[PDB]
Design an enzyme around this catalytic site. Structure first.
Site: not given
Length: 407
Positions: A380-382
């Site tokens: 979910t970060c990238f």
């Protein structure tokens, strides 16, 4: 690979028959909770609102300070007076602008005012700064415990009044509302550096490379207080046997225990209007779609602002992906967003400015390389989706929906 085309078509037919004759369910409501992994979100939303029907409350607030005014206006009203009353919101000045539409926007402006850093209630989530998680140091506002109880009371009241809130939280917030346990994959969206650390601990031999104790040091409020995860954890050295228990105990404290009382107050205000044994119809991904609402996503703007790593545009797998995305309904498209970007909220400027932990991380589709017998994963970060090379389109579709719904 097989039975994939069936189990999806089976699920759509069951839900369609329930839509036609909802009396076919009847019986205890708890049976719907027990068999939620097959019920449609709209069917869930239907039977939920059904059991939710089993006076007038005048409130006047200043639009500049709707959060504190609503807080002080409802501070002495009991739970029964709030659960069972029609809120007639009035604005001091700007009066007579519209009718019941004031209540809809009363929830909207109240939703944004919760995350005002002047209250020290919520801190932005690293994966998407538009989503928020509770501030562990919320003691700066000494009356914060009465605020989370007030907030959960508003979130639950908006659910009862069928009003959507522009507030999206990290996943563990919805999991606490449903009583569901947190996972290490939740740490990804909240602290990817710690996630990469804990994952390395579970994957590599930590015999002499790293060493820790079952305790956490928090340099909070000018104090080097050390809290024991387990009893005597200050002295329990982490080895290889207790390695799995350390990561679990660490994630529990770093997520739920560090905000135990703020969440307990939040749940008290929430459960006072929506009982736990009927909000648990929804999973942590569906609970966000209940409060905020199902998004209307533009698959075109999504695919136009989509990059591919170790894949190519006009590939076979990429063709399977978008022919599957366009074959999904609003619920499955929303959960596909929640699977990759972590939220159900499309950026206001479009997917061309889809944000990540470092900034504008457009939707990436990587390649898994290892065994086409795995389910797709995501970070979910990238905003990247690890997609294994599936031979048949229907093997991709069922394996997507298997990761889209479950978790």
């Amino acid at each position: 690979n097989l039975f994939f085309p069936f189990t999806d078509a089976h699920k759509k037919l069951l839900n369609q028959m329930i839509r036609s004759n909802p009396k076919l369910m009847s019986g205890p409501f708890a049976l719907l909770v027990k068999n939620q992994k097959v019920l449609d979100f709209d069917n869930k939303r239907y039977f939920f609102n059904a059991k939710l029907k089993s006076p007038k409350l005048p409130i006047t607030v200043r639009r500049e300070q709707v959060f504190l005014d609503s807080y002080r206006a409802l501070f002495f009203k009991t739970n029964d007076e709030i659960k069972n009353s029609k809120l007639e919101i009035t604005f001091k000045g700007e009066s007579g602008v519209d009718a019941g539409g004031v209540t809809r926007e009363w929830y909207q402006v109240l939703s944004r005012q919760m995350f005002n850093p002047d209250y020290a209630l919520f801190l932005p989530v690293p994966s998407d700064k538009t989503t928020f998680h509770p501030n562990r140091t919320s003691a700066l506002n000494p009356e914060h415990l009465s605020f989370f109880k007030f907030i959960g009371m508003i979130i639950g009241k908006a659910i009862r009044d069928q009003c959507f809130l522009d507030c999206h939280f990290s996943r563990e917030v919805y999991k606490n509302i449903l009583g569901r346990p947190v996972s290490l994959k939740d740490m990804e969206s909240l602290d990817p550096d710690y996630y990469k650390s804990l994952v390395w601990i579970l994957e590599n031999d930590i015999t002499d490379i790293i060493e820790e104790t079952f305790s956490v040091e928090t340099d909070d409020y000018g104090e080097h207080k050390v809290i024991n995860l387990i009893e005597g954890g200050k002295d329990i050295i982490v080895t290889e046997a207790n390695k799995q228990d350390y990561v679990k105990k660490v994630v529990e404290y770093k997520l739920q225990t560090s905000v135990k009382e703020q969440m307990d107050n939040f749940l008290v205000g929430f459960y006072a209007l929506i009982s736990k044994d009927l909000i648990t119809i929804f999973d942590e991904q569906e609970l966000e779609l209940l409060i905020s609402g199902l998004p209307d996503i533009d698959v075109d703007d999504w695919k136009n602002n989509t990059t591919y790593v170790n894949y190519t545009a006009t590939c076979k797998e990429v063709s399977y992906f978008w022919r599957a995305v366009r074959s999904f309904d609003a619920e499955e498209r929303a959960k596909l967003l929640q699977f990759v970007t972590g939220t159900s909220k499309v950026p206001l400027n479009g997917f061309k400015e889809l944000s990540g932990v470092n900034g504008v991380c457009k939707f990436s589709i990587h390649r898994d390389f290892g065994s086409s017998e795995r389910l797709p994963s995501s970070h979910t970060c990238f905003n990247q989706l690890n997609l294994p090379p599936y031979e048949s389109y229907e093997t991709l579709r069922g394996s997507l929906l298997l990761a889209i719904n479950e978790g």
